[PDB]
Amino acid sequence: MNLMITLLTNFTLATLLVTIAFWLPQPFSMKFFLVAITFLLFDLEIALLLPLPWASQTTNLNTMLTMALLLIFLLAVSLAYEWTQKGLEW
Amino acid sequence: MMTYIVFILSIIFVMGFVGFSSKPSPIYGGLGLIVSGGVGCGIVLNFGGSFLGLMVFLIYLGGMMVVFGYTTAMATESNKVVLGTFITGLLMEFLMVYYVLKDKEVEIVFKFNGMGDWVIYDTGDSGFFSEEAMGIAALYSYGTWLVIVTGWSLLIGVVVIMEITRGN
Amino acid sequence: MWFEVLPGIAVMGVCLFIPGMATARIHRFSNGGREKRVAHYSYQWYLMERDRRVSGVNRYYVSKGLENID
Amino acid sequence: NVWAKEPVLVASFAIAGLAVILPTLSPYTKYSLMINRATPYNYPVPLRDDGNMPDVPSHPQDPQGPSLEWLKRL
Amino acid sequence: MSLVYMNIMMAFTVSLTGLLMYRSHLMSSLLCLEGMMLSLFILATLMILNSHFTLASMMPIILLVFAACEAALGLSLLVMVSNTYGTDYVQNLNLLQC
Amino acid sequence: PGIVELPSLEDLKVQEVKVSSSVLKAAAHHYGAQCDKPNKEFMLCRWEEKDPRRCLEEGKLVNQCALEFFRQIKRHCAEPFTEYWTCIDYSGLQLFRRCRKEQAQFDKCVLDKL
Amino acid sequence: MNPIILIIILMTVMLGTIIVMISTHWLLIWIGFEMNMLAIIPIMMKKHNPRATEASTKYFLTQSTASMLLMMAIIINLMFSGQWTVMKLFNPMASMLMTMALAMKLGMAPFHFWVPEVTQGIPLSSGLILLTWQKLAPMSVLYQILPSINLDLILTLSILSITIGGWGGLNQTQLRKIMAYSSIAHMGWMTAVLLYNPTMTLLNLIIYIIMTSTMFTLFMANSTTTTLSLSHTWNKAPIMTILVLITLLSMGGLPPLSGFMPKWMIIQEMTKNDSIILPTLMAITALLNLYFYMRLTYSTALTMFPSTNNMKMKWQFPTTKRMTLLPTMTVLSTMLLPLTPILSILE
Amino acid sequence: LLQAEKDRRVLQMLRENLEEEATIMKDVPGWKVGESVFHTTRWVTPMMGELYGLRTGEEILSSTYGFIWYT
Amino acid sequence: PFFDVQKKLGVDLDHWMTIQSAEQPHRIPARCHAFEKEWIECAHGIGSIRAEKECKIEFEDFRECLLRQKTMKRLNAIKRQRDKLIKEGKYTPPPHHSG
Amino acid sequence: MFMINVLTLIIPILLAVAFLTLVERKVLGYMQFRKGPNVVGPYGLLQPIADAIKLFIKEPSSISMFILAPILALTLALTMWIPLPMPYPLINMNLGVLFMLAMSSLAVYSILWSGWASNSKYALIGALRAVAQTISYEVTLAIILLSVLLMNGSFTLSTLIITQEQVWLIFPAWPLAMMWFISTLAETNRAPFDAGPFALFFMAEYANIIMMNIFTTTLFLGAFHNPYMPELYTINFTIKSLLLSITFLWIRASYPRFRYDQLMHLLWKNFLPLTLALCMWHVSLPILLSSIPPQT
């Protein structure tokens, strides 16, 4: 309720400022699309990666090391595949 | 200003899903789905709630509706049916709220105890390591097979996307 | 030179200084002089909760130390 | 040659190659494992005493059992 | 059961009806599939948190990354349709008749 | 189904350590060594039988042990132990590295006198 | 495409089916179905006509809503009795939505409209892989969840699938819609036995897959879409005629021929129950679907149509594909009547 | 030490609330008076509605949901 | 069908995700641990149908652990009778903080 | 009193933004060659107050979309100084860096909505490309943030401000920090990396800028935290944030805008292998130096 109250105050002051700001007068490109899906897939691999530092204290350090390097290596390999296959040209 | 804030936020959640299930213009739909995902994240962050909804808040509300609005803006661009279905969905919401409140139980095909419920809930037990965060801090010791097939399906999704969008 | 730009920079440096200093002022003012607790985990929440229970005044900062012994 | 055309690519492969190869050989991974093992999250249980076993020290100052000591001893 | 579970399932089935019956565009249909993804996510997450079933906490995040790449495949297909025609209507699919 | 049985109210009046939490963390270790020879009996009862309403008498025994321990530390050295726990008291989430010199003072107290 | 890329994608379709066959955890089943979908889309649209774009669009929408409905069934299962063991469910509602998820998955008569549409608008290789593997893998799921099925589900979906896949097929002159209607007919035969003795269903699965592989290799003898093209296959080659004859009547299932082993043993260990009206109705509709097989036979291998010059020009050249595995599957799909005691090879 | 105090407090609230379940339904028909729902007499941990009932707002909000939107 | 490569290769690489009563990552249980352990040890070496004949009691006990629906039913009946008696006029409430 | 905490948090940031406008105009003049503004008002402070007043006076879609773009931009600008530990942060979020990423994504939403409601195809394709180059750097920002807190254990960021007492964290990852700072330049939408109410839109932009400056100063360096006297820490922290903001001006006033395809080509094929290699080195290496940080 602390941060709910703060969030609500931000919303109310922003609406107050908007109402003061308002009341006082009164074909495409295919290359656009690949950027979005490239972001979407690398952002999903981000979503897998980023809870790593919570995990970084285990007793099976070798397994965590190997699968962590597997994840980043696959991310770089997908980058390498679109790199060799001219995936972001312009 | 009272106890049943989970039920209240769940009412706003059902409001949002109805508000884009009435098939609007798709950017009105994207607005409604952003509001729906925000209050669902609020709900899960109210059931404690430390991590996982906020984790997906980046992804589902940080990496999905952006791409939907993107591909809506570069594809294409009031009516009685949309507004009528919205009002009737709101009416079914109103009727289900009424049968929760002024009765004992509600059955669709279940039995739901009709009262706002903090129950069930933890009895203040000593975690000290924030249980769901260490649950997500699995997949990296025990999770051998799962991240292997997950990253593999990610790589196959990459090559599939580029091939369908004209490899090469 | 910079002889007429340090007024604006100084005033804006005060205007960035003020919320942290006011927040620390209010954190000390609203605890009887203590520091506000920070329970990241449920264990520190339970410890803080029994602390505010045994103060009697529903206010944990009092902390009733070594006086309800015997 | 190999360096002038794509320099940051070579530097990235170099630091990636050492970040793969170097976790094999190190004099410190056993220390990482022992430090990571010996930090008790949960509660180490008391047990019904023994079948007259020459282990499980009774007093928490009795030096029979397993001990972490090299934190002070580097 | 509870009170929250009935409302989340009601939201799910309304999202399912919005997925099934759909009038003019396909983007709104795939977007309702995304909403159904959200509903399954929230449902499984609140189940696992209320159980304190800490072990298989993989379910919600891996469910969502996978149904996310499902939506990525869908957006690729929809943009392919809108390339090879003018719009993304349910019309222009009237050929290849049964 | 079968109905439960509990001990009544006249079994659950045992005088409790009505001290705060900051001091209770501040005197942790020497409580862990001086007393707490019989609390592991309570812990063994609690793990081998996960039924409170069976093990509570060992809870009474550890209650009176801890009360005797705080009696012993109150009526003797140290009085600047009170300054020690109120020094660790205002330091947010509690660290043992911040208010350290008074911890060494309290330790010199307890090693000399007791 | 690259051949590297296709060997990777076929490896992933195989990987999805092996994960579905192999696991004891419901999330792995769902990921298997999804990965199978994800990889099976670019086997379609090997060309780039709008036919394949629309067909893959329809297949994607139906398949993805089936997968999300399956995940709904799993989540209901764990709202109830909570464990990830692939076994008996604990809700008739969960079993209901799960059977309807599979009925949208592999094609049953309420849910079957996408199958002829998607099989016409693609080349034959994509149709081959989709029919064979996409109808192989969810039968494993049914074999794992057989003890907790309301039989009215499988009964209704099975009977209705047999009769719809029968009655569709009298009008279609396109080869691929004929083959998809035959597919729904065998899905009815492969599903109605399931709550009685599933060894029958898995043997029927192996039979149907071998038959349909023979059929698509014979329609890859040259790229044919109507029946008229098969009359020209008569004029250019004599032995493709007699193999279309034998394999079409084995799809029909006559007792001297190996397509009768699915009907025969299933009627046997169906009526060692006392369902009799249901088997005899199923066998009457099995008589019905043989008609379009028979009119294809009458069109090409038995009568002879008028034909066209430049087939004179085609006489010189070899039909020099490699047939992938034609002869083994032919005489293993047709002459395998006297080995019905290889039923019990299975378990 | 805290575990012993927590045992005594939860047994105290259970005794209070079963005494008041015996009072609050003093004349209703049917109704055995102390029905555990289960079939095995073990120690259930209750579900924070029997630990905290009839409190009207203050302790239930500031003792269940207080931590989550606190800090 | 279903194969047993999970069994023959021996490494139970998926039987850790499956149920409770395993290596939860730091050794804590769930809420309904002992119910699951009792029901599993009820129906372990049993042929899944006389399990349904003779493990019904503990399985209902487990479902009442997980859902606690009957306990909520009793609790709601208590609260609605509390409401009707406090509306009708017996003990303007002392049952909290003043016994 | 908590409402007074709220008002002292979210009101003086607007005065901070206005005086940032005067500071950036003055210092960019003294870079270029310009006194000014020094005429209206003593040394130019009444001049920005009058700037905001005059822009409020003037008399200038789908009023739904037309209002919901700047309302979201400015409520992001308000909400996004919640967990920044000016020593006592306003809400002690147990995880806040993921909240930083999520609200950057919400800013992407705001720009896309205003571009859709602009309703003219040249502004539409311009806003589309700006969305793509805003979203193209939240990858790198996320992964560098991951590697810099992996050296420090937990998402809490108060543990981070503990751990930067010994060394400034700019030393044990300098190229990683440099690449994060270039990505902050990209996310702020300024040079080199590139209709109303412009007051609100402008305001949200500059508040996001000062947020990234303060988050840079907290994430990478700082001062020693005095027990029971945080005023000295606040002073040295604020002066470091201001020197980095002047450095941000100093980078502004000297470089041309990139070509857009050069920007994307540079991001992918120049940051993205180098960030990945540095991040896998910060994965594999603290397990090799006997040093994994204590998540508490």
Residue numbers in the entry:
A (entry chain D3): 1 to 26, 50 to 113
B (entry chain D6): 1 to 77, 85 to 175
C (entry chain A1): 1 to 70
D (entry chain A3): 10 to 83
E (entry chain 4L): 1 to 98
F (entry chain A8): 1 to 114
G (entry chain D2): 1 to 347
H (entry chain AM): 73 to 143
What's in the article?
The ETC is composed of four large membrane protein complexes: (1) a H+-pumping NADH-coenzyme Q (CoQ; ubiquinone) oxidoreductase (complex [C]I), (2) a succinate-CoQ oxidoreductase (CII), (3) an obligatorily dimeric H+-pumping CoQH2 (reduced CoQ; ubiquinol)-cytochrome c (cyt c) oxidoreductase (CIII2; cytochrome bc1 complex), and (4) a H+-pumping cyt c oxidase (CIV) responsible for O2 reduction. CI is an ∼1 MDa membrane protein complex with 45 protein subunits arranged into two “arms”: a peripheral arm that extends into the mitochondrial matrix and a membrane arm that is embedded in the IMM (Hirst, 2013, Sazanov, 2015). In mammalian heart mitochondria, the majority of CI is found in association with CIII2 and CIV (SC I+III2+IV; respirasome) or in association with CIII2 alone (SC I+III2). Here, we report the isolation of functional SC I+III2 from ovine heart mitochondria.
Initial 3D classification identified four classes of SC I+III2 particles. These differed mainly in the relative angles between the CI peripheral arm and membrane arm and in the angle between CI and CIII2. The assignment of the closed state was based on clear density adjacent to the CI Q-tunnel for the NDUFS2 β1-β2 loop (residues Gly52–Gly60) and for the ND3 TM helix 1 (TMH1)-TMH2 loop (residues Pro25–Lys54). In all other classes of SC I+III2, these loops were disordered, suggesting that they are distinct forms of the open state (or deactive form) of CI (Blaza et al., 2018, Fiedorczuk et al., 2016). We identified striking changes in TMH3 of ND6 between the open- and closed-state structures. Whereas in the closed state, ND6 TMH3 was a clear α-helix (residues Leu52–Met74), in each of the open states, the helix was interrupted by a π-bulge midway across the membrane (residues Tyr60–Met65). The ordered ND3 TMH1-TMH2 loop in the closed state crosses directly above ND6 TMH3. This loop, however, was disordered in the open states. Additional large conformational changes were seen in this area: the short three-stranded β sheet of NDUFS2 that harbors the β1-β2 loop was adjacent to ND6 TMH3 in the closed state but rotated away from TMH3 by as much as 10 Å in the open states. Surprisingly, the CIII2 MT-CYB that is in close contact with CI showed lower overall resolution in the SC class containing closed CI than in those with open CI.
